[model samples]
Target chain A: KTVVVTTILESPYVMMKKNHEMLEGNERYEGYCVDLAAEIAKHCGFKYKLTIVGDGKYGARDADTKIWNGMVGELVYGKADIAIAPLTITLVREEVIDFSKPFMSLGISIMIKKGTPIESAEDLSKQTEIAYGTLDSGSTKEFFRRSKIAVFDKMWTYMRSAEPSVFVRTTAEGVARVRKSKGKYAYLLESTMNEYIEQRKPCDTMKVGGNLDSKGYGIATPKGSSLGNAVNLAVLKLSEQGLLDKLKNKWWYKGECG
Target chain B: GANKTVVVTTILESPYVMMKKNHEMLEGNERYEGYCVDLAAEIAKHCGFKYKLTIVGDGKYGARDADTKIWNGMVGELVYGKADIAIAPLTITLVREEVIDFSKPFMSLGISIMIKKGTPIESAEDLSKQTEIAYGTLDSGSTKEFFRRSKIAVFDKMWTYMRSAEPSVFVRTTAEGVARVRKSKGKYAYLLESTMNEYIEQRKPCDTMKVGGNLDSKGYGIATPKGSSLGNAVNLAVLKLSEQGLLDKLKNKWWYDKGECGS
Candidate 1:
């Protein structure tokens, strides 16, 4: 049986292949996670199909309904066999699922217009002129919500109650808002995505400041799934072999910015 | 299982794990005190396990012998089942993770540059573009492996110089690296994890500083053998502590509150 894999269509991680209209099935997609999926499949010795999440979300559980959604929902509800995207390895999610060793490390980072005066999170926090926000229903937003640090706690206070709401439904929406907001807006996103975006054609955005916090992304599987063992071992094997590093360089550096 | 005392392998690094001054008079796990010491207590309490802290025999954090494929130090102990767990400043790295399991990081850090207080270099690019200041990292550690395997031009260039430098720039231990920086009169820069760099910076006669942002980001995790039953419980405990702010409090308890350098 072909394993069903759930992923998100985030750039650099997953993007519709050029001329996707002509491609069939899995050939329609190509990017970092797509490449990683193949490597994982090869190592784990399984055939799999890549399907985008039904509602196009990373995954979050609803407090009101006590239900899971997005890629996590697919796995929890048995709609998919595994998730092989840039899914973060967060504690809340780990309670309901199993994650392989981290394949990539990232942290919340600030993305600013090329000439934006912001140099750090404090720069954005100290001034209210530039509006900042994070992807809604994601770990980055949750970080600010649950933070204990002064700067982040203050930032969270403003974001949660800001006029017009500062959160966005998707990462692409957040990046688009930053690019067009003419320095009036900043996006708090994962550093990996920030680095990838700055290298693309419309390279008007750059990541400023060191990472606000550190974490990693792992391949997620349903708890007690037999594939968990093989997938986890495969991730470690790929990391030790340095194949993951080569994959990162291959996709992240080949952009049009240079 | 209830009768078994968990063997926790650790290192004797400063601030993370260290022998108490009243040493030789204290006994067993009581002989040590540091950040990890406090953490081990919390973890044991939450996980409901009695444990013993044993220092690694080789005094190394852990590294693989390139030619032999054998692991040594704390990681080796876990892989060979000599210890049930590792609670120390053990870095979470690719090669090591292949053999042992790691809980999600209990702490975050990155490779940082350490220099005498008056050193002119501010960034890795600065060190990469010059030869007057010698820079290197601890031997058989992740820092050295990072440079050797880095494809980035600047780090790659530095690696070339350090590996061929006449004095053998690599140090056998982190203390040796710091000692070289202190004694070389601003002529040597030590590349180590930011956690240690910051710890040392706040110690007595603080004449060294961590310059520039970290070159990379990583973390330290509680380690167990690949398939240990304790892995899941310990990993969750770390997350629980982090969420409840105990991790942050522990950091303050060991790093800043006890700092010797005056603010």
Candidate 2:
């Protein structure tokens, strides 16, 4: 039986077909996230098929629309057996699903147009010149909302008061705003995705600040799934053998995305 | 009748077990003294085993050489059928535990750093970033082996740099590393057990102090073979000693006191 994996179209992790006519699920499979899912499935003695989420939105309980998207919704509604996207583990999400031991660790970072005066996350926390927002309902937004640390608490105040429409619906939309705003706006995202985008062509964006806080990206499955234990162990085994690092280097640093 | 005495093998550490002056004239288990010696006596009484103490042939404890797969210390003596048991501060690391069956931990310890009084370094982070101050660990022991196999980023980098350093940075024993730090003024630091570091701190002309937090978390256990008959008895003896507070008394008597070589 094939495990249906829910993922998103983010560079280095998952990317849409450059030539849309040549796209197929596993045949044209590429991206660090897809490669990781395939390797884990092989090691765990399971077959899997990747299915992109219907909507671009990451998991969130929308106050306005009351909808969820990406892997969160797929697993919530039992549409997928596992989620292999760059999904961050949060307490709210943990209430409804179980996450494997973290396969990767990263922190939310700010991306500004190159030549911006912002040099660090510290600088971004102290200023009001540039409007900053995260992909609504994603890990970045949740992190700021839940943080207890001083700098993050301050940044959270700014995000909560910022204009509601300024919050982008997707990561791509946030990056687009940064690109066109010409240093007037910044996007908050995971450092892995930020770095991956910084190396791409037409990469006018740069990760200006150090990571805001440490968080982990984990494989998510529906509550009490039997595959959870095996998948968690597989991640640790792969981490020990350095295969995770190899795949990260292959797809993000040296692959076509870079 | 056949010899009924159980042969016990041990290493020659200062406070754990050492030969007394009268031991030269004594016979059998009476030849030894110290914490392990007394603990062995209590264990033998509780377990109802007649035992004799013998020193390991090679000076080294447990060692694994790539060419020869021989382990020579007290642990070796038990593995090779030369002795019925081993009672020492022999650490119970994961690799060692895989080979021999160990009882509940008699003591807990962690690998720590030791530097001279005036060194600027205070933590592992400070040591890793600086190139001027040299640091190393014992060559063939558990602590050294840990750094070699570690996956943590800071330790992994340290292992690579120490292995290929120009002056040959690894020491053969904890003593050698401690001595290097003492003689080198503030130029070098040694990494070893927190127990041993505290022992050295109380010695005369104390020049060393433990620095940095523990590298890893682990405990020392009373070990026997996979299914040794004495395993349960030995584990119980350790717990009895712990409950009576005799274990702490023994550590102070052997490790902290200043006395003759075998006093």
Candidate 3:
């Protein structure tokens, strides 16, 4: 059976090649996840079509309707056979979809412009002279909303009640706000994503401080789907064989940004 | 020609502020030896002020008590007009910002996770996700404050797990935390500021390592009461000190220069 792969176009994860027009289907895509899809397909003995999740959003559960959105929704609706992207394997996401053993590891980190006085999260959390934002209702925002720890909870109050709302539609929007704010703004996103962009031309951004928290990205299939077992095994084999490490080095550093 | 002595309030925090170990043989301000005393001397020399070093009766970094209707610590000393300025490792947090003006950060740091050498845990997430390793911070410090104020999921999850863990995860001093990491046989980790973590990592035995990166960012600033006249002069002096490389040298003097462990 052909496995339908649902993924997103996050840098270093799944990116369309510059010569995509000259290529066809999966051949047109090249990135960490694209390479991973090929390897997993070979191991699991299945052909797969890489379909981009229609909404261009990382999966999050809507608190009101209680429905999973983004890649999660596509899985629940049987729209895709599996999801393979930079999807954070959070506790809430685990309840709705089954994830393979983590394919990659990551954590949240600060994104700062060159010469930014911002040294750490505590530095900016205590001041209002600067603006910061994360993707709205996404992992970062939800992190603050549902937290009970003291500083994070306090930060949550500050961010939630902050006027003019620091939440943004996407991580790219955050990168723009940080670049032009004249030291008045910072953006928070995944460390991998931040490092990927920091290497691009005009590399004025930096991933400052250690990660706020840590987690991993896993290959996900529908809950209870037999495909989940095979995918998990494949991921473990790759990790043990250093194949995942090789792929990451290829996309992230082997020929990466300036 | 009054030549009034500026009342400077500071605590006995080590390295930043502390009583001279030979204090029994000394008297008055001479009894204290630390970065703060030296810093006060430097600032006074630059700002044209004569100051008296006095220990804050209540040793605190400063916090506004909700029920007492009064401030506490060095911050309180400034608020009540009992002190002119505080040249100490007082962290510049948001809550304390409303009542005091701080010079641009004199030192930058963040919360960090410390694990003894050869621990299975490689990151903060490893501690939070598993039950084998127990972790905690000092009983009364900013790191604890960070944990209490955090709302992030992994941190929040860690809080729930740590707050209720058996035998209580919190410790009373940095030494105690370090000792625990050494004694636990890979079963304990300590959350502390990066500065302290780095200091201990370089100390004798060298059994512990600062794993991963800092959890959050913050800085220490020279503080004065809000609107105090000394604010501008002290802030300017600080900027000059930083620009002249004195700040770097001062840190080297305290942390690295005094390192007792081997290369």
TM per prediction = 0.79, 0.55, 0.52
Best by TM-score: 1
Error of 3 at B10 (Å): 48
Error of 1 at B263 (Å): 8.8
Candidate 3 lDDT by residue in tens digits, B1-263: 56788999887766776777889999978998877778888899999989898888866566666687688778889999999888887876655666787765677777898998999887778888898788998764567766676666688788888788889998865668889999999889999888878888778888888888777655677889888888867876875665444776787787788787765
The CAPRI classification for model 2 reads as: incorrect
lDDT of 3 by residue, A1-258 (tens): 788999987777888899899899998888999999999999999999999999887778776898877888899889998999988766567667777646676667889888988888888788888877788746777777776556667777887777788888777788888888887888878888898888886778888888776556778899889897677668756654447777977887723343
lDDT for position A140 in model 2: 80
Clashing residue pairs in all predictions, respectively, total 0, 0, 17
lDDT, residue A188, candidate 1: 96
Q: lDDT tens digits, residues B1-263, model 1?
A: 45699999998888989899888999999899999999999999999999999998988878888799888889899988899999998888877877888998888887899999899999999999999999998877888888898777888999999999988899887889889999999999999999999999998789999999987756799999988999999998987787666887888788899789977
In TM-score terms, candidate 2 sits at 0.55
Worst 10 residues of 3 chain B by lDDT: B239-248
RMSD of each: 4.7, 14.2, 19.8
Q: What is the lDDT of residue A57 in candidate 3?
A: 79
Per-residue accuracy of model 2 over A1-258 as CA lDDT, tens digit each = 999988888777887556655877675656888788888888898988988887865688767876666678889889999999788866567667777656666777889898998887667789988888888768787777766667777988888887755688877788889999978898888898888778886868898757765556789999889987678668756754557767877876633434
Instruction: Give candidate 1 regions above 4 Å deviation.
Output: A114-130, A148-151, A254-258, B1-5, B24-30, B48-50, B62-72, B79-82, B93-99, B108-172, B177-219, B243-263
